[PDB]
């Protein structure tokens, strides 16, 4: 089984524009949204069909109550941060927690916070400590690390509960998450050689150019892996052609355990 991950995000805005939610929470399995909640709807709803069909209404009712409490806690924490920063206006507070189940069977776990889109506090579940970026975060670090039981709780949830939730969701949407659609790869000229792939899933793909069997990463332009809108993805990579000398250029694409080579005549 390939590498998979489960993550939950939280967004808090202090003085939002009218109509924009004060609080938003979204969960993901890989790049797939699975759950959503905001301060406007005040309801936790599935964002994937295989989540809605495998979780009874009692699951969504329970976490609706929890998110309503977590929404208020996020509001109190953001109010504390902005007061200690002596900042006026609207500012953002973000949270990210999750885990990965790698291909070899090993696991990772992470939990971190952000203020105005920049790292604020980062949790280390091995040393059981919080990394603070400034003195406002240093104050929060002191209060959180005085609650040793909460640090141990976060270590257990990241290493045990998160991985267990991930395996559960992986089985729910195995027809989506564990399928493989190979890419359609082509090469055209535009002077640079553009190697383009599309129609592939999972989105993880490695595209590069080789000049006479040697990879020169400095002169390769890499395009982003973009969603096509139908569940598949597309990407590209270009390299500049030497007008003074001919060379043996070949595009190399690796996707889901299969390697591809497109030699340019």
């Amino acid at each position, epitope marked *: 089984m390939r590498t998979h991950s489960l993550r939950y995000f939280r967004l808090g805005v202090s003085d939002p524009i009218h109509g924009v939610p004060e609080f938003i929470s979204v969960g993901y399995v890989d790049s797939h949204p699975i759950t959503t909640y905001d301060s406007v709807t005040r309801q936790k709803e599935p964002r994937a069909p295989w989540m809605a069909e495998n979780l009874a209404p009692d*699951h969504w*009712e*329970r*976490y609706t*109550q*929890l998110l*309503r*409490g*977590w*929404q*208020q*806690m996020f509001k109190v924490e953001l109010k504390r941060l902005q007061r200690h920063y002596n900042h006026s206006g609207s500012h953002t507070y973000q949270r990210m927690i999750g885990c990965e189940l790698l291909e070899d069977g090993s696991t990772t776990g992470f939990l971190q916070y952000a203020y105005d889109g920049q790292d604020f506090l980062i949790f280390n579940k091995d040393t059981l400590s919080w990394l603070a970026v400034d003195n406002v975060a240093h104050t929060i670090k002191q209060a959180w690390e005085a*609650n040793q*039981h*909460e640090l*141990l*709780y*976060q*270590k*257990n*949830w990241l290493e*045990e*509960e998160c991985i*267990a*939730w991930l395996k559960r969701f992986l089985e729910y949407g195995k027809d989506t998450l564990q399928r493989t659609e190979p890419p359609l790869v082509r090469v055209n000229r535009k002077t640079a050689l553009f190697c383009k792939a599309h129609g592939f899933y999972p989105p993880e793909i490695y595209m590069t150019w080789m000049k006479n069997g040697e990879e020169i990463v400095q002169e390769i332009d890499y395009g982003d892996i973009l969603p096509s809108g139908d569940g598949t993805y597309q990407a590209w990579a270009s390299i500049e052609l030497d007008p003074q000398s001919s060379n043996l250029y070949s595009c190399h694409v690796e996707h889901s355990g299969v390697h591809m080579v497109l030699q340019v005549p």
Partner: antibody, heavy 109, light 116 residues
Framework: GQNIDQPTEMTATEGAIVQINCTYQ??????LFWYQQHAGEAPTFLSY??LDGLEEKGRFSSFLSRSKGYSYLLLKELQMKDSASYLC??????????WGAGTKLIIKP | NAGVTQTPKFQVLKTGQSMTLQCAQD?????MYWYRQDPGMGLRLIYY???????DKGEVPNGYNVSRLNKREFSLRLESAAPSQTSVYFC??????????????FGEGSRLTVLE
């Protein structure tokens, strides 16, 4: 589907040691709590375990084994005031408490 | 600093009689709960309030209703008392809910006897 089990009653002698067991079968695990409740009074928090090992707090110590799904509350140098019911509770995957029926500790002076 | 204050300590009720149990906490907590304790079984949640402005049913909501009147107060309502509701009712509170290591703070308890 979720079950908590602890003995109904235990009797020990003053000054001795007693070990109150709590086994649990739950869908997920977010921690095990121990509470003390004297007769006719409110339960009060005693200890919390979420990782494996033994934590000490005065004469009381609490142990946890996640793989075996079992915990014990250890009371050393028993006194008459230790006579109470001791409740064990576990938070499941959805952070809901599942309560054991409680163990009544009787101390012989 | 009184903690959790619930009333009344005792109450006799006739079948069909209405009753309201009060509960207040001065610890600036967000989560409040209502339990019933019966012989031979563990505490069973009736209703809970994860935060101010929201409530939801517990394990045994039938025959009861609650109201999170404000951040401090969480009342339990028996509209038509039944003999099966003879129990000791405990109201509790915690700083937050879904926090993991956060413990509960219980009130003194309310003993109820419903008689035909």
């Amino acid at each position: 589907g979720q079950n908590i089990d602890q003995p109904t009653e235990m009797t020990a002698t003053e000054g001795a040691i007693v070990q109150i067991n709590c086994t649990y079968q739950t869908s997920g695990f977010n921690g095990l709590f121990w509470y003390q409740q004297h007769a006719g009074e409110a339960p009060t928090f005693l200890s919390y375990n979420v990782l494996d090992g033994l934590e000490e707090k005065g004469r009381f110590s609490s142990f946890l084994s996640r793989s075996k799904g079992y915990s014990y509350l250890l009371l050393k140098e028993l006194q008459m005031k230790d006579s109470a019911s001791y409740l064990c509770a576990v938070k499941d995957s959805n952070y809901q408490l599942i309560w054991g029926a409680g163990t009544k500790l009787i101390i012989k002076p | 600093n009184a903690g959790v204050t619930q009333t009344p300590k005792f109450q006799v009720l006739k079948t069909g009689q209405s009753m309201t149990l009060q509960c207040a906490q001065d610890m600036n907590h967000n989560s409040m709960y209502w339990y019933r304790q019966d012989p031979g079984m563990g505490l069973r949640l009736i209703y809970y309030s994860a935060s101010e402005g929201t409530t939801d049913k517990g394990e045994v909501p039938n025959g009861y209703n609650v109201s999170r009147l404000n951040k401090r107060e969480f009342s339990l309502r028996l509209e038509s008392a039944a003999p099966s509701q003879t129990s000791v009712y405990f109201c509790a509170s915690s700083v937050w809910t879904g926090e993991g290591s956060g413990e509960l703070f219980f009130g003194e308890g309310s003993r109820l006897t419903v008689l035909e």
